[PDB]
């Protein structure tokens, strides 16, 4: 794992010692190179995970997440360098440094062998994200958003810290392999109930679970474009990865401790999808869509079947790509017209045709058109839920309809009709923006050909 990690660290002084006009070029080139090297973790043994050393290991659950992180960094650099043009050299280097530190923390968190190291890195991701949001955020509301993002997260994660140190005192280890091989059932007692809650609530608030989701519209809407990209594509998946890891010590209690979280996630799926139908802000709509998708992932993890875990992995990856693409698409128009309101600019297909094609493809993967991997994940989760109880189809069926509705609503409102007469500063699409969209989209389509790579450990 050292081969991936050291170069990422190297990226730091490479950008601090670069000429003022070459920072973006250098960072993008070597980020792409790092992504290529990482691509080699997808070779998986089968029966067990690849254990590089005592400290790091890679899984089939882990490999897809790492490749997505490393691939997301150059895209964030492409998306950032436009609105950061007026910035001083030192502040541009500081912004790139924040992004690099975030990538470094993320890679380590996914591959840490034991929970305490996972916890420390999973929490260290908070600092660069908060700095990005509050320092480079466009609006006044960013300060409030930063506080919401911090406090919601820490209120969940500190009980997890207490629970983890208690578990290592009683078991003797927090190493994930030892944790798995020496697993013993959790009795049904008040102590075990609160241990379960303390082990679960941090990852629940990271997802986010419905009702503990209020930080996400704030933080995802008030952040700069790269902040939003990394918040939706990767940082939401920390909760899913951590839950998939931690639920091995929680059996057989999960059988009934999962009921309220399943109820919240299914009904709130319906709720956030309906909310997307009456939204005046375009980033707000994409944020709530992310919430709806992660509710599906929460259900999949709580019901604890091989098909549900496979579907959850596929949906996490597909959501990460699609949501980042949608945020970038919204940001291009925002850059044009300097407002987030969805009905301000209309009929953009008449003015920007290729960007309208990108819009259509992103909207089609958001509603999970077959045979995209979005539908693969959603279908696997829906089947597992059907096995869990046949009545889930009603909720699942309803959600599919509302998602199609708001996806095509967004597409029709922004691209179709007639253009607003007054706005006359809509310039042709830049090569940078088109290439950013293609680099989001091509990987998703390519993934359909080889579905097993994003499927996970259960496969």
């Amino acid at each position: 794992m050292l081969k991936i990690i050291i170069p990422t660290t190297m990226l730091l002084p490479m950008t601090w010692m670069s000429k003022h006009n070459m920072i973006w070029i250098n960072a993008t080139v070597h980020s792409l190179l790092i992504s290529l090297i990482s691509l080699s973790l997808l070779n998986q043994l089968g029966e067990n995970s690849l254990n590089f050393s005592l400290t790091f290991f890679s899984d089939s659950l882990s490999a897809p997440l790492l490749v997505l992180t490393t691939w997301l960094l150059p895209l964030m650099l492409m998306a950032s360098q436009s609105h950061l043009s007026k910035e001083t050299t030192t502040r541009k280097k500081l912004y790139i440094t924040m992004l690099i530190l975030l990538q470094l923390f993320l890679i380590m968190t996914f591959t840490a062998t034991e929970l305490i190291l996972f916890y420390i890195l999973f929490e260290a991701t908070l600092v660069p994200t908060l700095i990005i949001i509050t320092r480079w955020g466009n609006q006044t509301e960013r300060l409030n958003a930063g506080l919401y993002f911090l406090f919601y997260t820490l209120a969940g994660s500190l009980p997890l810290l207490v629970a983890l140190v208690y578990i290592q005192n009683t078991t003797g280890s927090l190493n994930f392999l030892i944790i798995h091989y020496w697993s013993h059932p959790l009795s049904n007692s008040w102590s075990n109930i609160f241990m379960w809650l303390a082990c679960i609530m941090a990852f629940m608030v990271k997802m986010p679970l419905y009702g503990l989701h209020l930080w996400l519209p704030k933080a995802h809407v008030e952040a700069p474009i790269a902040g939003s990209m990394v918040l939706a594509a990767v940082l939401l998946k920390l909760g899913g990865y951590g839950m998939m890891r931690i639920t091995t010590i929680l059996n057989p209690l999960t059988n009934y401790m999962a009921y309220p979280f399943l109820m919240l996630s299914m009904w709130g799926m319906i709720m956030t999808s309906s909310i997307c139908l009456r939204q005046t802000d375009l980033k707000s709509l994409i944020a709530y869509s992310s919430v709806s998708h992660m509710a599906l992932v929460i259900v999949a993890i709580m019901i604890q079947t091989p098909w549900s875990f496979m579907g959850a992995t596929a949906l996490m990856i597909a959501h990460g790509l699609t949501s980042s693409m949608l945020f970038c698409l919204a940001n291009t128009n925002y850059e044009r017209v300097h407002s987030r309101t969805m009905i301000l600019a209309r009929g953009l297909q008449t003015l920007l045709p290729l960007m309208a094609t990108w819009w259509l493809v992103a909207s089609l993967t958001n509603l999970a058109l077959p045979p995209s991997i979005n539908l693969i994940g959603e279908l696997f989760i829906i089947t597992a839920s059907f096995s869990w109880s046949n009545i889930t189809i009603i909720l699942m069926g309803m959600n599919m309809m509302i998602t199609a509705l708001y996806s095509l609503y967004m597409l029709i409102t922004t691209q179709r009709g007639k253009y607003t007469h007054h706005i006359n500063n809509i310039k042709p699409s830049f090569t940078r923006e088109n290439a950013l969209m293609a680099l989001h989209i091509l990987p998703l389509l390519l993934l359909t050909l080889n579905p097993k790579m994003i499927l996970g450990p259960l496969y």
């Binding site: 400290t55 840490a112 062998t113 034991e114 305490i116 190291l117 290592q168």
Partner: protein, 57 residues
């Protein structure tokens, strides 16, 4: 034939010959508790270092 002792003589510490046996336990002491065993052996480095959560040294 009595000679008055000179200055400084009655305050001498002198020796006494006696048949009285020297008392063995004039304090009536109990038996002292046993000490703790002791430190012994060669010092080997701690197995697997410190063993703090994730540290390998």
């Amino acid at each position: 034939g009595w000679v008055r002792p000179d200055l400084g003589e009655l305050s001498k510490v002198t020796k006494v010959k006696t048949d009285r046996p020297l008392p063995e336990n004039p304090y009536h002491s109990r038996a002292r508790p046993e000490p703790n065993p002791e430190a012994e052996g060669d010092l080997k480095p701690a197995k697997h270092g410190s063993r703090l959560f994730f540290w390998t040294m």
